Nucleic acid binder design. Structure first.
Ligand SMILES: Nc1nc2c(ncn2[C@@H]2O[C@H](COP(=O)(O)OP(=O)(O)OP(=O)(O)O)[C@@H](O)[C@H]2O)c(=O)[nH]1
Ligand SMILES: Nc1nc2c(ncn2[C@@H]2O[C@H](COP(=O)(O)OP(=O)(O)OP(=O)(O)O)[C@@H](O)[C@H]2O)c(=O)[nH]1
Ligand SMILES: [Mg+2]
Ligand SMILES: [Mg+2]
Ligand code: NA
Ligand code: NA
Ligand code: NA
Ligand code: NA
Ligand code: NA
Lengths: 171, 171
RNA sequence: CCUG
RNA sequence: CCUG
């Protein structure tokens, strides 16, 4: 059992490479409206979830949605890679503005697992160098997450640990 | 600040080398009866907090006290090094027996800091090899703490982070 | 210091 | 994929 305790008013930031299973995990554990996805936001602004050139607009939209949810006291899960500190920073700031608890859930999986999953995907794929970079960035990020402002930091170190997760929401 | 959230019913396990500041930290944040110290227990059984030969008796007494407190629903802080998995295991089990949440607070400080603190102590000192070993064991322990059963894992990565700590005890 |  |  991998029990992850979170407050009812949480901003849950998923941290993981492309192919690490973030979207699958979010669908398993949360309501669809609780999950806001950066790729979905690329689709909202451009019709194309794969379009990297609309990244700025997509994240502007994602951040705006997060802010409205937290204003209204609604638990929110950010489904994006979040492997760069510069990506996490504005999310921590929004949580701070609305007195919300930021939670980090890190998919600390071997690069090989993510590359294999990516190779077999039919929906969307990235190049191998992208997953190599994401995995390196994820690993470098782990130590400093608490200091960034994550009040709960949960690291999942294998697919077996990921599969075992159950969230306990505390009111 | 470094806010560490803990439930009202917690077993707080301090993890750190001799010289890492565990006892000083414990008295800043918790009342005296909330803190049970392994060295104090060596004193209870033998008159000598330094005596390594009475370690079995001392931990038998400490575990018994912890069990009585958790049975009565009283928050308890374990002031011992807790750098070996075999030392943490019985503590996790006692917490489980009494439906208490185990919390890890790790003093991830450089060996050098602990060594210099140790040299300037007038109350009690250990040999250099002891602190070198404890620091290695502490660092090797960090990754696996969640999987051992610690429901919250807090790592303090510098004296500055230690100084910023505020416990938020949740009703 | 759960005992080099 | 917060854009080699
Ligand atoms: N066995 C198993 N496979 C998984 C799991 N999660 C994801 N996968 C596989 O990995 C592929 C990618 O999963 P996603 O959930 O889309 O991964 P992601 O982290 O959202 O990837 P990006 O959206 O590109 O960042 C899926 O199509 C699955 O085949 C899992 O929990 N268990
Ligand atoms: N500057 C500074 N010194 C500290 C701090 N905490 C503890 N010290 C000093 O470090 C020395 C050791 O501190 P303790 O609190 O006894 O450390 P410990 O982890 O309990 O050590 P053991 O009981 O041998 O395991 C003492 O002389 C303290 O005054 C701190 O936060 N800042
Ligand atoms: Mg996805
Ligand atoms: Mg002490
Ligand atoms: Na923009
Ligand atoms: Na792509
Ligand atoms: Na890599
Ligand atoms: Na494991
Ligand atoms: Na260990």
């Amino acid at each position: 059992s991998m029990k992850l305790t979170i407050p009812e008013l949480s901003l849950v930031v998923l941290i993981g490479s492309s192919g690490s299973g973030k979207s699958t995990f979010a669908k398993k554990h949360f309501k669809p409206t609780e999950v806001i996805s950066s790729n979905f936001c690329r689709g909202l602004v451009s019709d194309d979830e794969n379009d990297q050139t609309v990244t700025g607009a997509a994240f502007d939209v994602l951040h705006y949605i997060v802010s409205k949810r937290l204003q209204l006291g609604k638990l929110t899960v950010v489904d994006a890679t979040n492997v760069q500190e510069s990506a996490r920073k504005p999310l921590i700031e929004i949580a701070k503005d609305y007195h919300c608890f930021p939670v980090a859930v890190v998919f600390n999986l071997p690069e090989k697992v993510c590359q294999e999953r990516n190779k077999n995907r039919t929906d969307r794929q990235v190049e191998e160098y992208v997953i190599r970079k994401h995995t390196q960035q994820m690993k470098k990020s782990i130590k400093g997450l608490q200091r960034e402002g994550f009040r709960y930091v949960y690291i999942l170190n294998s697919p077996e640990e990921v599969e075992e997760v159950v969230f306990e929401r505390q009111p």
